[PDB]
Amino acid sequence: VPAGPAKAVLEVNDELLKAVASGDWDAYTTMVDPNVTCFEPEAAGVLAKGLAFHKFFFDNRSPNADKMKTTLHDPAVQMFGDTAIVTALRVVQFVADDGPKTTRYEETRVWVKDAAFKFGWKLVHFHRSGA
Amino acid sequence: VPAGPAKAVLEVNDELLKAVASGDWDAYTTMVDPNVTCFEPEAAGVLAKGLAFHKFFFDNRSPNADKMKTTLHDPAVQMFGDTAIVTALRVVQFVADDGPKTTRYEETRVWVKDAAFKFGWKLVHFHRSGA
C-alpha cells in the first residue's frame, strides 16, 4: 500500500534518522537538499548551511556515537502546498562520563516536494534544540 | 517603494515582533494563523497549537515584560513557492533578580502566502530555542 503525502514525508523523515544513526552519508544525500540550512546544537549558535557542514560529522564520527539510541516521539506533519512541516520530539540515549543519560530535543523539519529526489521529498531546513 | 516577496516577509516578521513587544493582540491576529503551531520555551517542551495559547501570555503580561528590549539579528529568508522560511537570532535584554541580563535565541519562522491576510502572509509555525 502506497503512502499519501503526509504519511510519505513522515516515512522519509524516519528514514533520514536511520541514515544519520548509521553514518550512511550516501543515504543522507538522497534526502537532504544541497543548500539545506539548520539550527542545531552542533552549529554553535548560528545558522549552518550546506551539506559539507554535515559531512564533517559523518567523516569524523566519534567517540561513542555507536552506543547511542535515538527515537522520534509525537511526530506530526502539516502540509502547505508543496511544503511539509514535520515536528517531533527526539529522545537520545547516550553514555557520558557519569554513566548512561537521556536527552530530549524539539525538532522542526521542513520538507519540500521534489520529484527529482529519490523519495519525492527534500529536506531544506531544520531546527533542533535541547531541553 | 514596494517590497518584493523576501523583503516583504522580513518586514512582516519584524512587525510581528513589534506587536508582541507592545502586547498588541489585535495586530498579532492580523499576522498569525489561527492554527499556528510552535516550539518555544513557554510551551513546556511540547508543540503548542492555536492562538488561545498565545493570547494567555498577552492577557497575563507580567511582571517586567515592559523593561524588556528585543532585537532580531542576522535575519535571512529562503523561499519555496508560497512558503518563506525566516531564520534569525533573537537577543533579549531583561532584568532578573541578579540584575540586567541578555539572552540569545535561535528562531525559525515559517510564513505562508495568503492574500486574505492583512500583509499577504501568515505565520503557520515557529521554533524558538534558548542558548
Numbering used by the authors:
A (entry chain A), B (entry chain A): 344 to 474
Sentences from the paper on this structure:
Ca2+/calmodulin-dependent protein kinase II (CaMKII) is a Ser/Thr kinase that is particularly important in neuronal signaling and cardiac function. CaMKII has a unique architecture, in which the catalytic domains are linked flexibly to a hub domain, also called the association domain, which forms a dodecameric or tetradecameric assembly. We reported recently that the activation of CaMKII-α by ATP and Ca2+/CaM triggers the exchange of activated subunits between different holoenzyme assemblies. Our data are consistent with the idea that the CaM-binding element induces the hub to transition from a closed-ring form to a ring-opened lock-washer configuration, which can release or capture dimer units.
Choanoflagellates are the closest living relatives of metazoans. The choanoflagellate S. rosetta has one CaMKII gene. The quaternary assembly of the S. rosetta hub is strikingly different from that of all other hubs in that it forms a right-handed spiral, corresponding to a hexagonal P61 screw axis in the crystal lattice, instead of a closed ring. On looking at a projection down the hexagonal screw axis, the dimers are arrayed in a circle with almost the same diameter as that formed by the dodecameric forms of human CaMKII. An orthogonal view shows that the helical pitch of the assembly is such that the sixth dimer is displaced vertically by the length of a dimer, with respect to the first one. This positions the seventh dimer directly above the first one. At 48 μM, the tetramer and hexamer populations increase further, and a population of octamers now appears. These results are consistent with the open-ended spiral assembly of the S. rosetta hub, which can gain or lose dimer units without steric constraints. Despite the striking dissimilarity in quaternary structure, the interface that holds dimers together in all metazoan CaMKII hubs is very closely preserved in the S. rosetta hub, with helix D from one hub domain packed against the β-sheet of the adjacent domain. The principal structural difference between a subunit in a closed-ring hub and one in the spiral S. rosetta hub is a rotation in the outer edge of the β-sheet with respect to the inner edge of the sheet and the α-helices. The interfacial interactions between the vertical dimers of the hub are between residues on the outer edge of the β-sheet in one subunit, and residues presented by helix D in the other. These interfacial interactions are preserved in the S. rosetta hub, but a change in the curvature of the β-sheet results in a change in the orientation of helix D in each subunit.
